[PDB]
A paper describes a structure:
Herein we provide evidence that Ca2+- and redox-dependent regulation is directly linked within one protein, involved in the regulation of photosynthetic redox regulation and oxidative stress defense. This protein is designated as calredoxin (CRX, Cre03.g202950.t1.1) and consists of 4 EF-hands that are functionally connected to a TRX domain. In this work we characterized functional properties of CRX, which is conserved in the green algae lineage but absent in vascular plants. Therefore, we conclude that CRX is localized in the chloroplast stroma of Chlamydomonas. In this work we characterized a protein designated as CRX, representing a new class of Ca2+-dependent ‘sensor-responder' proteins.
The phases of the native crystal data were obtained by the molecular replacement method and the structure was refined to 1.6 Å resolution. The crystal contained two CRX molecules per asymmetric unit and the electron density map was clear enough to refine the model without any non-crystallographic restraint. Molecules A and B contained 313 and 310 amino acid residues, respectively, except for flexible regions, four calcium ions in each CRX molecule and 1,156 water molecules in total. The CRX molecule consists of two domains connected by a flexible linker region: the CaM domain with four Ca2+-binding EF-hand loops and the TRX domain with one disulfide bridge. In the CaM domain, one calcium ion was bound in each EF-hand loop located in the N- and C-subdomains, respectively. The TRX domain exhibited the typical TRX fold, possessing four α-helices (H10–H13) and one mixed β-sheet. Side chains of Cys238 and Cys241 formed the disulfide bridge between the second β-strand and the H11 helix. At the interface of the two domains, extensive inter-domain interactions were found. There were two hydrogen bond networks between the active site of the TRX domain and the Ca4 binding site. However, it appears that the TRX activity of CRX needs Ca2+, as the TRX domain without the CaM domain is functionally inactive. This is an intriguing aspect as the structure of the TRX domain showed noteworthy similarity to the conventional TRX molecule (r.m.s.d=1.36 Å for Cα atoms of spinach TRX f), strongly suggesting that the Ca2+-dependent activity of CRX is modulated via the inter-domain communication path which is absent in TRX f.
Residue numbers in the entry: 18 to 189, 195 to 335
The structure:
């Protein structure tokens, strides 16, 4: 009775919303009613009932937090906290589909790390490759090496992205590829399918795989060197970076395909086959080794060593 009118209206609306989510009308929100409430669009007003898209982890994640008394069900008071914390998708299915298509510059229907990097950089918040690893670990939950639509949705649920970033990005032909390398720059990959695509796309260049780990310090020291070699040697060599520990696929590439035992590791592929392997932080040795594979290398070295310089002849 003694609530103010504005508060009474807010509460009446939360009550209306709660009753809507409580589909069976039984007075509360169980785990399976909450699954659909989390799968919904337009602030709980449109349920996508074709089939489920939310991973089970996510629902359990949600009950863990908002079920405070631990009776396996969501009460009205607990439901308010879900609303306040912004868990429901506010946009329409079409707005999320438009945003996904905008980010998927290749137009193949999935978002790769290279695409994510461009989105962040284009919006003035360029991210490091190590941070792209973190984004993929947090959102590529099926270890596909791509962000599919349902995973993109969780970027909005968690406020990593906002539908205004998207409108801005839209303001700023397509290949159809899984990955499109940027000439002169290393490509960070998250799947074997991307590795193979890059090899197939570069039949007449050497492909150098830079294997790193996210906590490896000497690896970090080689990142700037490799960026300079990727520019200098672009007519001859494409570089492809993978962090072995990123996901199930990268672990397998490290252990089964290349048998990488120490990092940083540089594996040079000719027509997809390892022909030259070097490990560690010796830049002079790495570059001399790469150069020895090239008929007509660029003039000048980035990391000369006395030995690597031709005598006056
Ligand atoms: Ca119910
Ligand atoms: Ca509860
Ligand atoms: Ca794409
Ligand atoms: Ca995925």
């Amino acid at each position: 009775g003694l609530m103010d009118d504005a508060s009474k209206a807010k509460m009446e609306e939360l009550e209306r919303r709660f009753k809507m989510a409580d589909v069976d009308g039984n007075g509360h929100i169980d785990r399976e009613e909450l699954r659909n409430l989390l799968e919904s669009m337009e602030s709980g007003e449109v349920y996508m009932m074709s089939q489920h898209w939310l991973p089970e982890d996510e629902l359990e994640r949600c009950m863990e937090q908002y079920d405070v008394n631990k009776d396996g069900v969501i009460s009205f008071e607990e439901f308010k906290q879900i609303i306040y914390d912004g868990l429901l998708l506010e946009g329409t299915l079409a707005e999320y589909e438009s945003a996904f298509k905008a980010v998927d510059k290749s137009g193949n229907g999935t978002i790769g790390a290279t695409e994510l990097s461009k989105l962040f950089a284009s919006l003035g918040n360029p991210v490091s490759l190590e941070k792209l690893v973190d984004l993929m670990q947090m959102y590529d939950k099926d270890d596909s090496g791509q962000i599919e639509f349902p995973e993109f949705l969780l970027m909005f649920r968690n406020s990593l992205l906002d539908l205004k970033d998207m409108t801005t990005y839209m303001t700023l032909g397509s290949s159809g590829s899984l990955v499109d390398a940027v000439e002169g720059d290393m490509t960070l990959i998250f799947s074997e399918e991307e590795l193979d695509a890059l090899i197939s796309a570069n039949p007449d260049k050497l492909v150098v795989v830079f294997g790193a780990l996210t906590w490896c310090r000497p690896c970090k020291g080689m990142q700037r060197p490799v960026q300079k070699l990727a520019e200098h040697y672009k007519d001859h060599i494409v570089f492809v970076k993978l962090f072995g520990n990123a996901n199930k696929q990268t672990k397998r590439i490290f252990k089964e395909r290349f048998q990488i035992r120490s990092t940083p590791c540089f594996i040079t592929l000719r027509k997809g086959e390892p022909v030259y392997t070097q490990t560690g932080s010796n830049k002079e040795k790495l570059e001399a080794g790469l150069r020895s594979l090239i008929a007509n290398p660029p003039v000048g070295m980035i990391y000369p060593s006395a030995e690597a310089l031709a005598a006056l002849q």
